[PDB]
From Swiss-Prot:
Result of changing residue 71 to E: Causes telomere shortening
Effect of residue 103 to A/K: Impairs interaction with the telomerase RNP and causes telomere shortening
Protein name as catalogued: Telomere replication protein EST3
Gene name, Swiss-Prot/TrEMBL: EST3
GO cellular component: chromosome, telomeric region; cytosol; nucleus; telomerase holoenzyme complex
Amino acid sequence: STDSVFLQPWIKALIEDNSEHDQYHPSGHVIPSLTKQDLALPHMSPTILTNPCHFAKITKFYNVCDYKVYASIRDSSHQILVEFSQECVSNFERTHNCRITSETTNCLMIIGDADLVYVTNSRAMSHFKISLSNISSKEIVPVLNVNQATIFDIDQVGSLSTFPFVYKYL
């Protein structure tokens, strides 16, 4: 099923339960690893369907650096920045024959093999190309690092509004 009924809040709870940025592993994975088969047919994979954590929406992308894509995603609740590893990019391209920023800001995406890591202002400035001072209340904010990703035009997504959520209520 491609129904969006499987899109439930998880980002908010995830960052709240892992607010200990000094204790949580920098590369601590937050969701199960997905396969190329899962990325091929995520709407046919119960592992994904029954786990809202795998569901995400793209609101806007920033840039690409070091063969990694830097964008912003959210869910039914709050919004958080996401970095796509070189592995993620390569696999995505093989699957979809396109880039992760190829008109995906109104599409519905699925993440896999992702971990949670906290970054500073200068980091988000140098990586995501955006200072946190304008999009956060704190100098240190959580970011999602995704190794498996696949995007399908299922659910139309709104644009990136000018207001932080996860970085505002951290």
